[PDB]
Enzyme design. Structure first.
Site, PDB file in Angstrom:
ATOM      1  N   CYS A  41      40.255  23.295  34.115  1.00 24.76           N
ATOM      2  CA  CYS A  41      39.971  24.588  34.178  1.00 24.76           C
ATOM      3  C   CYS A  41      39.047  25.148  33.257  1.00 24.76           C
ATOM      4  N   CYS A  46      38.305  27.196  36.444  1.00 25.51           N
ATOM      5  CA  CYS A  46      38.451  28.662  36.211  1.00 25.51           C
ATOM      6  C   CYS A  46      37.242  29.315  35.517  1.00 25.51           C
ATOM      7  N   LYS A  49      33.605  28.912  36.566  1.00 23.02           N
ATOM      8  CA  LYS A  49      33.857  29.831  37.994  1.00 23.02           C
ATOM      9  C   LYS A  49      33.629  31.216  37.603  1.00 23.02           C
ATOM     10  N   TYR A 180      40.087  27.872  49.354  1.00 19.40           N
ATOM     11  CA  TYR A 180      39.636  28.693  48.286  1.00 19.40           C
ATOM     12  C   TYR A 180      38.248  28.388  47.513  1.00 19.40           C
ATOM     13  N   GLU A 184      34.742  30.326  47.573  1.00 21.63           N
ATOM     14  CA  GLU A 184      34.310  30.880  46.284  1.00 21.63           C
ATOM     15  C   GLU A 184      32.954  30.513  46.129  1.00 21.63           C
ATOM     16  N   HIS A 450      45.692  58.590  41.001  1.00 22.18           N
ATOM     17  CA  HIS A 450      44.701  58.711  41.970  1.00 22.18           C
ATOM     18  C   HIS A 450      43.449  59.359  41.290  1.00 22.18           C
ATOM     19  N   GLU A 455      46.590  52.690  44.777  1.00 24.04           N
ATOM     20  CA  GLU A 455      47.445  53.930  44.984  1.00 24.04           C
ATOM     21  C   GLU A 455      48.044  53.685  46.383  1.00 24.04           C
TER      22      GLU A 455
HETATM   23  C1  LIG Z   1      36.292  24.394  41.032  1.00 20.22           C
HETATM   24  C2  LIG Z   1      37.930  24.996  40.529  1.00 20.22           C
HETATM   25  C3  LIG Z   1      37.984  26.366  40.219  1.00 20.22           C
HETATM   26  C4  LIG Z   1      39.515  26.425  39.955  1.00 20.22           C
HETATM   27  N1  LIG Z   1      39.608  28.019  39.630  1.00 20.22           N
HETATM   28  C5  LIG Z   1      40.950  28.231  39.131  1.00 20.22           C
HETATM   29  C6  LIG Z   1      41.377  29.553  38.589  1.00 20.22           C
HETATM   30  O1  LIG Z   1      40.274  30.395  38.893  1.00 20.22           O
HETATM   31  N2  LIG Z   1      42.412  30.033  38.465  1.00 20.22           N
HETATM   32  C7  LIG Z   1      43.549  28.950  38.315  1.00 20.22           C
HETATM   33  O2  LIG Z   1      44.776  29.404  38.104  1.00 20.22           O
HETATM   34  N3  LIG Z   1      43.204  27.764  38.703  1.00 20.22           N
HETATM   35  C8  LIG Z   1      42.278  27.318  38.781  1.00 20.22           C
HETATM   36  N4  LIG Z   1      41.799  26.090  39.405  1.00 20.22           N
HETATM   37  C9  LIG Z   1      42.893  24.887  39.300  1.00 20.22           C
HETATM   38  C10 LIG Z   1      43.057  24.643  37.731  1.00 20.22           C
HETATM   39  O3  LIG Z   1      41.747  24.060  37.245  1.00 20.22           O
HETATM   40  C11 LIG Z   1      44.077  23.277  37.531  1.00 20.22           C
HETATM   41  O4  LIG Z   1      45.058  24.017  38.457  1.00 20.22           O
HETATM   42  C12 LIG Z   1      44.585  23.141  36.424  1.00 20.22           C
HETATM   43  O5  LIG Z   1      43.277  22.803  35.443  1.00 20.22           O
HETATM   44  C13 LIG Z   1      45.675  21.866  36.276  1.00 20.22           C
HETATM   45  O6  LIG Z   1      46.146  21.846  35.067  1.00 20.22           O
HETATM   46  P1  LIG Z   1      46.395  19.997  34.832  1.00 20.22           P
HETATM   47  O7  LIG Z   1      47.058  20.509  33.559  1.00 20.22           O
HETATM   48  O8  LIG Z   1      47.271  19.838  35.573  1.00 20.22           O
HETATM   49  O9  LIG Z   1      45.247  19.272  34.595  1.00 20.22           O
HETATM   50  P2  LIG Z   1      43.812  19.131  34.293  1.00 20.22           P
HETATM   51  O10 LIG Z   1      43.585  20.416  33.680  1.00 20.22           O
HETATM   52  O11 LIG Z   1      43.045  18.688  35.098  1.00 20.22           O
HETATM   53  O12 LIG Z   1      43.763  18.223  32.930  1.00 20.22           O
HETATM   54  C14 LIG Z   1      44.105  16.775  33.171  1.00 20.22           C
HETATM   55  C15 LIG Z   1      43.380  16.205  31.739  1.00 20.22           C
HETATM   56  O13 LIG Z   1      43.959  14.946  31.786  1.00 20.22           O
HETATM   57  C16 LIG Z   1      42.932  14.030  31.252  1.00 20.22           C
HETATM   58  N5  LIG Z   1      43.138  12.585  31.525  1.00 20.22           N
HETATM   59  C17 LIG Z   1      43.537  12.326  32.635  1.00 20.22           C
HETATM   60  N6  LIG Z   1      43.811  10.901  32.984  1.00 20.22           N
HETATM   61  C18 LIG Z   1      44.214  10.695  31.519  1.00 20.22           C
HETATM   62  C19 LIG Z   1      44.595   9.590  30.877  1.00 20.22           C
HETATM   63  N7  LIG Z   1      44.924   8.078  31.885  1.00 20.22           N
HETATM   64  N8  LIG Z   1      44.685   9.587  29.590  1.00 20.22           N
HETATM   65  C20 LIG Z   1      44.035  10.323  28.801  1.00 20.22           C
HETATM   66  N9  LIG Z   1      43.505  11.749  29.319  1.00 20.22           N
HETATM   67  C21 LIG Z   1      43.535  11.539  30.872  1.00 20.22           C
HETATM   68  C22 LIG Z   1      41.671  14.921  32.110  1.00 20.22           C
HETATM   69  O14 LIG Z   1      40.629  14.156  31.142  1.00 20.22           O
HETATM   70  C23 LIG Z   1      41.633  16.106  31.755  1.00 20.22           C
HETATM   71  O15 LIG Z   1      41.388  16.738  30.911  1.00 20.22           O
HETATM   72  C24 LIG Z   1      40.462  25.813  39.449  1.00 20.22           C
HETATM   73  C25 LIG Z   1      40.454  24.418  39.849  1.00 20.22           C
HETATM   74  C26 LIG Z   1      38.760  24.126  40.088  1.00 20.22           C
HETATM   75  C27 LIG Z   1      38.533  22.377  40.407  1.00 20.22           C
HETATM   76  C1  LIG Z   2      37.826  68.042  36.451  1.00 17.30           C
HETATM   77  C2  LIG Z   2      39.261  67.629  36.735  1.00 17.30           C
HETATM   78  C3  LIG Z   2      39.346  66.283  37.100  1.00 17.30           C
HETATM   79  C4  LIG Z   2      40.651  65.972  37.925  1.00 17.30           C
HETATM   80  N1  LIG Z   2      40.851  64.595  37.860  1.00 17.30           N
HETATM   81  C5  LIG Z   2      41.970  64.297  38.436  1.00 17.30           C
HETATM   82  C6  LIG Z   2      42.413  62.846  38.824  1.00 17.30           C
HETATM   83  O1  LIG Z   2      41.288  62.245  38.724  1.00 17.30           O
HETATM   84  N2  LIG Z   2      43.446  62.428  39.065  1.00 17.30           N
HETATM   85  C7  LIG Z   2      44.594  63.476  39.096  1.00 17.30           C
HETATM   86  O2  LIG Z   2      45.710  62.979  39.473  1.00 17.30           O
HETATM   87  N3  LIG Z   2      44.214  64.660  38.769  1.00 17.30           N
HETATM   88  C8  LIG Z   2      43.377  65.088  38.436  1.00 17.30           C
HETATM   89  N4  LIG Z   2      43.037  66.394  38.278  1.00 17.30           N
HETATM   90  C9  LIG Z   2      43.920  67.435  38.299  1.00 17.30           C
HETATM   91  C10 LIG Z   2      44.270  67.629  39.751  1.00 17.30           C
HETATM   92  O3  LIG Z   2      43.081  68.336  40.104  1.00 17.30           O
HETATM   93  C11 LIG Z   2      45.235  69.034  40.077  1.00 17.30           C
HETATM   94  O4  LIG Z   2      46.355  68.428  39.274  1.00 17.30           O
HETATM   95  C12 LIG Z   2      45.737  69.217  41.466  1.00 17.30           C
HETATM   96  O5  LIG Z   2      44.408  69.690  42.154  1.00 17.30           O
HETATM   97  C13 LIG Z   2      46.992  70.261  41.365  1.00 17.30           C
HETATM   98  O6  LIG Z   2      47.389  70.445  42.720  1.00 17.30           O
HETATM   99  P1  LIG Z   2      47.883  72.083  42.985  1.00 17.30           P
HETATM  100  O7  LIG Z   2      48.537  71.795  44.291  1.00 17.30           O
HETATM  101  O8  LIG Z   2      48.960  72.368  42.096  1.00 17.30           O
HETATM  102  O9  LIG Z   2      46.633  73.090  42.941  1.00 17.30           O
HETATM  103  P2  LIG Z   2      45.318  73.098  43.549  1.00 17.30           P
HETATM  104  O10 LIG Z   2      44.801  71.629  43.877  1.00 17.30           O
HETATM  105  O11 LIG Z   2      44.533  73.595  42.685  1.00 17.30           O
HETATM  106  O12 LIG Z   2      45.151  74.261  44.787  1.00 17.30           O
HETATM  107  C14 LIG Z   2      45.612  75.545  44.623  1.00 17.30           C
HETATM  108  C15 LIG Z   2      44.850  76.105  45.782  1.00 17.30           C
HETATM  109  O13 LIG Z   2      45.486  77.496  45.815  1.00 17.30           O
HETATM  110  C16 LIG Z   2      44.475  78.328  46.267  1.00 17.30           C
HETATM  111  N5  LIG Z   2      45.142  79.458  45.857  1.00 17.30           N
HETATM  112  C17 LIG Z   2      45.165  80.056  44.966  1.00 17.30           C
HETATM  113  N6  LIG Z   2      45.854  81.221  44.740  1.00 17.30           N
HETATM  114  C18 LIG Z   2      46.236  81.465  46.072  1.00 17.30           C
HETATM  115  C19 LIG Z   2      46.403  82.869  46.741  1.00 17.30           C
HETATM  116  N7  LIG Z   2      46.832  84.103  45.841  1.00 17.30           N
HETATM  117  N8  LIG Z   2      46.418  82.674  47.916  1.00 17.30           N
HETATM  118  C20 LIG Z   2      45.856  82.030  48.748  1.00 17.30           C
HETATM  119  N9  LIG Z   2      45.408  80.911  48.278  1.00 17.30           N
HETATM  120  C21 LIG Z   2      45.454  80.748  47.192  1.00 17.30           C
HETATM  121  C22 LIG Z   2      43.162  77.598  45.413  1.00 17.30           C
HETATM  122  O14 LIG Z   2      42.028  78.152  46.183  1.00 17.30           O
HETATM  123  C23 LIG Z   2      43.380  76.443  45.731  1.00 17.30           C
HETATM  124  O15 LIG Z   2      43.118  75.671  46.614  1.00 17.30           O
HETATM  125  C24 LIG Z   2      41.582  66.832  37.933  1.00 17.30           C
HETATM  126  C25 LIG Z   2      41.428  68.259  37.447  1.00 17.30           C
HETATM  127  C26 LIG Z   2      40.275  68.499  37.363  1.00 17.30           C
HETATM  128  C27 LIG Z   2      39.853  70.219  36.955  1.00 17.30           C
END
Ligand SMILES: Cc1cc2nc3c(=O)[nH]c(=O)nc-3n(C[C@H](O)[C@H](O)[C@H](O)COP(=O)(O)OP(=O)(O)OC[C@H]3O[C@@H](n4cnc5c(N)ncnc54)[C@H](O)[C@@H]3O)c2cc1C
Ligand SMILES: Cc1cc2nc3c(=O)[nH]c(=O)nc-3n(C[C@H](O)[C@H](O)[C@H](O)COP(=O)(O)OP(=O)(O)OC[C@H]3O[C@@H](n4cnc5c(N)ncnc54)[C@H](O)[C@@H]3O)c2cc1C
Lengths: 461, 461
Positions: A41, A46, A49, A180, A184, A450, A455
């Site tokens: 790894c 891992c 990579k 995989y 990759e 959101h 979501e």
């Molecule tokens: C290209 C690739 C990408 C991978 N990417 C991921 C990932 O992204 N996420 C993930 O979860 N897994 C990943 N894996 C799998 C992960 O690498 C192995 O699942 C993990 O290393 C296995 O753990 P191990 O303890 O079984 O063996 P190993 O990690 O291989 O360790 C075995 C150790 O035993 C030693 N050994 C061997 N024989 C003996 C001996 N007779 N005496 C003394 N020392 C000795 C070797 O030298 C070595 O260090 C990847 C595998 C590879 C090849």
């Molecule tokens: C800059 C900013 C960023 C935000 N980013 C996020 C986020 O990223 N994620 C998140 O979850 N929330 C976010 N929010 C909060 C989210 O926008 C509000 O929580 C959400 O719009 C509220 O829903 P509402 O139904 O209560 O009101 P509103 O969406 O405001 O709708 C009220 C509606 O009622 C209408 N209305 C009003 N009065 C009347 C009337 N007398 N008659 C007729 N129509 C009328 C208005 O025109 C309008 O359209 C953000 C808020 C802002 C200001």
């Protein structure tokens, strides 16, 4: 013969995790490692990579610069600049892991370990013998490569290990495999500028994932410029005057096979599988059970057929992920040294993220697995497909697909599958929810955040 | 007097959500809107804000280009290029929402609504009268601005509404306020190139959030180049020969106050609060209860003090978020037209994301609120602070902070607070988990996804 309370063979993800938790519990532990701590790894997995993935993501976003009101970025990617920084980061991690061991008072035995003919389980490293009432095998695995006998010139290609040794970006690359790792690698090389082709035996990649994912991922790969060669395989490889020439056979069902030569290939990357590292362990000396691939066989508690000997990680051939090796290793330490005999890892609902473009996140059963386990009548799925808001102003587009698999009348969420921007950091929390046994109602009763892509999962209908 | 089954005043987040669910249930509904459908969120809120945030994120990542092996990007940001694309996107959304209404057979009454003196609840829009057994007020609110009487020259500044009307990037901007809107505006303007200052009454922003967040956010703002003017407020504003001149007083506790003039200010943005839109509703005509801010008072079912009249959204002044208005509006439709008298929104554990840089995600109780509700003895918190892997190769750095608040011996997760890269898409799932009543053990028993920032939350110790 030096004796310890716990002897761990392999200083990788599982080994280190297990040794450190054991020490915490008072066990006098020692770790045997023949190479670099951190294992696969940290050194060739891992970590390096992800660094390269972050680099590819930079390239993709650079394509959108102009769309976002910025002046277009011109540049050629400089591979060795990032390679050097990457190597350095791995170096820092190695130093950190060694420190972690010393601080825990875990002895580090440098060298290759093998079991001896001795009665009670004993190993030998550089002539010296070591033993313990509990020995853990966590030797992991290695990349699989074709035999020259089956595919001539196979040794001319590289594996994922070699990929991390590359000092320059290959002009033309061919990746063979549909898992995989293959996906990759292809994604990174293509995004960084290499004319990339991915050779797969069938029509889609990641065929073991939910059908919606394999289908979508194959399409996104193609939309990204990756040439997916379906129903093809290498027949032979040969070194020409400039690069490699790959001879491949394409056999589309319901059609006549056709041979094709791919010339001027700078990099042929085999990503066809992994083989366990058990060959030179002298396991036979103790009669430890393995399957025909060389994987050590274990029960639900990581027990081998021999008392006092356990195995976790890639060496057991199931769920090949670092976090799984770690969790299994820790659960084992608690069962052995804290005497919690019920301590073991549940291999169900393990989440996975594939760092493709966009990334894939998955946890639980695919629609097909749920249907086989509960029956078509009891399985309901919900899904959506949309273009992330980020692309509302760009010419380039990627999609976001999400699918939720529910079972029974209660609609228990047994599977979540998705691909899209942000899905890599989106999965963890839902994985917790699924592990807890959430139902669709639980998702639906959670107020949405959101505006985000996440979501969408709590507002499915 | 045309009669309907459901009359919704306000075509914003809550109004539209409620009207559409009601229609689905068979109700003959009508929506009154005096302006643009979609309300605040679509037209001058969530949507245009997120587009601008994505634009700012582009700027930040462009700073890291060289670190990732790419040639440095040179360009000046072109504001009107993005402003036009942004405006267009909002236009598309408006058209879509109208279509959604028509398809649901919901009548759209264009104009301003007000209650009449008539006995049974009735409103008048452009001379015509309308009534219904159930009337919903979802008129939202508007930006608050200081009175010229209290702050001379106040009318020279703009609000968040004006921000979306800007056609050019202000050279120098001063934002007044310490809430999420202020923070977001300051972050976007600063990242896009404006010399930005944020004026706050105390020493930190978002003081109503967990202390770890308010502290960290204030620091990150400063690290990003935003000048945070603490313990200050505007005394007066005046139009000079070139831009505005802001006179402010800085009163640091334990020090003598000092007046300062900020010259050549191109944009003064008031982000001090929101006022409910109830002024011209003639609520008095029916004696509908409001507080002294003008907020309509409602019970847990969104009932006002008058039978047949309800209110949801920003107009009620609590949890001012689009998803909350939507959920409350839907729950109401189900209670009224599906006769589920227990249908109502739980205002606890509502998740929020603040689009700062990096983004903030929060759900549940802050450490202080948990301590007041359960007692110092029963509250335990876990936290971590690290530099995301993405910055392992960059000169520029941001931090990631996470805090989990647990209560009682079971360690129920009552609050999660964090800031860092990816936290915007990371929150949703954990929010589901928290809503379900997860304990630390549930988080700990979920296998991690590596390598990600999200895995830190399931491996806290
Ligand atoms: C290209 C690739 C990408 C991978 N990417 C991921 C990932 O992204 N996420 C993930 O979860 N897994 C990943 N894996 C799998 C992960 O690498 C192995 O699942 C993990 O290393 C296995 O753990 P191990 O303890 O079984 O063996 P190993 O990690 O291989 O360790 C075995 C150790 O035993 C030693 N050994 C061997 N024989 C003996 C001996 N007779 N005496 C003394 N020392 C000795 C070797 O030298 C070595 O260090 C990847 C595998 C590879 C090849
Ligand atoms: C800059 C900013 C960023 C935000 N980013 C996020 C986020 O990223 N994620 C998140 O979850 N929330 C976010 N929010 C909060 C989210 O926008 C509000 O929580 C959400 O719009 C509220 O829903 P509402 O139904 O209560 O009101 P509103 O969406 O405001 O709708 C009220 C509606 O009622 C209408 N209305 C009003 N009065 C009347 C009337 N007398 N008659 C007729 N129509 C009328 C208005 O025109 C309008 O359209 C953000 C808020 C802002 C200001």
């Amino acid at each position: 013969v030096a004796s310890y309370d716990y002897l761990v063979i392999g200083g990788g993800s599982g080994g280190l995790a297990s040794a450190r938790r054991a020490a915490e519990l008072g066990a006098r532990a020692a770790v045997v490692e023949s190479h670099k701590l951190g294992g696969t790894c940290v050194n060739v997995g891992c970590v390096p990579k992800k660094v390269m993935w972050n680099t590819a993501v930079h390239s993709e976003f650079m394509h959108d610069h102009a769309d976002y009101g910025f002046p277009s970025c011109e540049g050629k990617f400089n591979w060795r600049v990032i390679k050097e920084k990457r190597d350095a980061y791995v170096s820092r991690l190695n130093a950190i892991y060694q420190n972690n061991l010393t601080k825990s008072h875990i002895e580090i035995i440098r060298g290759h370990a093998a079991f001896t003919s001795d009665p009670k389980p004993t190993i030998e490293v550089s002539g010296k013998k070591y033993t313990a009432p509990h020995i853990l095998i966590a030797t992991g695995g290695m990349p699989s490569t074709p035999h020259e006998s089956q595919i001539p010139g196979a040794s001319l290609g590289i594996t994922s290990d070699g990929f991390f040794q590359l000092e320059e970006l290959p002009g033309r690359s061919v990746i063979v495999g549909a898992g995989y790792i293959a996906v990759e690698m292809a994604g990174i090389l293509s995004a960084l500028g290499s004319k990339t082709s991915l050779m797969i035996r069938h029509d889609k990649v990641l065929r073991s994932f939910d059908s919606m994912i394999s289908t979508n991922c194959t399409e996104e790969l193609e939309n990204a410029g990756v040439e997916v060669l379906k129903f093809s395989q290498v027949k032979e490889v040969k070194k020409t005057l400039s690069g490699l020439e790959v001879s491949m056979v394409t056999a589309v069902p319901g059609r006549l096979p056709v041979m094709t030569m791919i010339p001027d290939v700078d990099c042929l990357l085999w990503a066809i599988g992994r083989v366990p590292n058990t060959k030179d362990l002298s396991l036979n000396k103790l009669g430890i059970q393995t399957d025909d691939k060389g994987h050590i066989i274990v029960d639900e508690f990581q027990n081998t057929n021999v008392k006092g000997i356990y195995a976790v990680g890639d060496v057991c051939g199931k769920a090949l992920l670092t976090p799984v090796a770690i969790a299994a290793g820790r659960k084992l330490a608690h069962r052995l040294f804290e005497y919690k005999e019920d301590s073991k890892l549940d291999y169900n609902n393990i989440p996975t993220v594939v760092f493709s473009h966009p990334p894939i996140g998955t946890v639980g059963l695919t629609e097909d697995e749920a249907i086989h386990k509960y029956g078509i009548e009891n399985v309901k799925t919900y899904s959506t497909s949309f273009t992330p808001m980020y692309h509302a102003v760009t010419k380039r587009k990627t999609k976001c697909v999400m699918k939720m698999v529910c079972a029974n009348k209660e609609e228990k969420v047994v599977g979540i599958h998705m691909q899209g921007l942000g899905c890599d950091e989106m999965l963890q929390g839902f994985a917790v929810a699924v592990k807890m046994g959430a139902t669709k109602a639980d998702f639906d009763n959670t107020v949405a955040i959101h505006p985000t892509s996440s979501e969408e999962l709590v507002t499915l209908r």
